[PDB]
């Protein structure tokens, strides 16, 4: 593909001091800003019940698999026009590598 | 995304007249001429274990989403240069529509 895995342990902690502020991703666990992850592999954007989506998330109807996933994480915002996450962006691939190992990984 | 739910009844006799001839779908299936494809969703290229894939296939690490599979569907030999299957392609995106609606709930 275009993504090729990394670490695990190296993407536990970026979740932590990248992600964890605004969202869960244990099953069971609650949205916050962010919805709660667990199980985001293979869903499409914007289904997770009980939460708020803006409008742009809902109508780019996303299959989340690891290689979208990576494009999203460099600029959310260009990705989805109008997406209210407020982060700017995972530049190097090998950070994405890492985190989305991680997620692949919890999110199960 | 940029593919639409159809008819898994549609894609049920799609299966049967179009791919049925190599493969099986159903979980505790056997590889024919080609591999079995129950849990095929999520999965990278070349990966079914037991069956002799070509080089180009493994190669290629395609992830399995609902999208690849359909640009796979249209023309499998442009998609995977070298590939061994012998199948010229389904045409029309409803075909398609309907078949991965059939797929995804069979290989699950
Ligand atoms: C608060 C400052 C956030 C941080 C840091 C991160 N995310 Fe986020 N995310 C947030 C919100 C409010 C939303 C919903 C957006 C909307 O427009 O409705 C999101 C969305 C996501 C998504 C899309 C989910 C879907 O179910 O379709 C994903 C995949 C996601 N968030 C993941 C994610 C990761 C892995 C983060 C660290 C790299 C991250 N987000 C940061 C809020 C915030
Ligand atoms: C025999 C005439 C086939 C027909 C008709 C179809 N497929 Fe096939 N397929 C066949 C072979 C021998 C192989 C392996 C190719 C190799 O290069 O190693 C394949 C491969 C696939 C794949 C890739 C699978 C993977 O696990 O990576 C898929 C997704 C697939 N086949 C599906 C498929 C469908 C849905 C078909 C009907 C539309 C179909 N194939 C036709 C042999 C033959």
Same mark, same amino acid.
């Given at each position: 593909?275009?993504?090729?895995? +990394?670490?695990?342990?190296? +993407?536990?902690?970026?979740?932590?001091?990248?992600?964890?502020?605004?969202?869960?991703?244990?099953?069971?666990?609650?949205?916050?800003?962010?919805? @709660?992850?667990?199980?985001?592999?293979?869903?499409?954007?914007?289904?997770?019940?009980?939460?708020?989506?803006?409008?742009? @998330?809902?109508?780019? @109807?996303?299959?989340?698999?690891?290689?979208?996933?990576?494009?999203?994480?460099? @600029?959310?915002?260009?990705?989805?026009?109008?997406?209210?996450?407020?982060? +700017?962006?995972?530049?190097?691939?090998?950070?994405?590598?890492?985190?989305?190992?991680?997620?692949?990984?919890?999110?199960?």
């Amino acid at each position: 593909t275009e993504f090729k895995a +990394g670490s695990a342990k190296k +993407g536990a902690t970026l979740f932590k001091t990248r992600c964890l502020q605004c969202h869960t991703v244990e099953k069971g666990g609650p949205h916050k800003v962010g919805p @709660n992850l667990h199980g985001i592999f293979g869903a499409h954007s914007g289904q997770a019940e009980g939460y708020s989506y803006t409008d742009a @998330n809902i109508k780019k @109807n996303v299959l989340w698999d690891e290689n979208n996933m990576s494009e999203y994480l460099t @600029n959310p915002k260009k990705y989805i026009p109008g997406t209210k996450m407020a982060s +700017g962006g995972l530049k190097k691939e090998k950070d994405r590598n890492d985190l989305i190992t991680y997620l692949k990984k919890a999110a199960e």
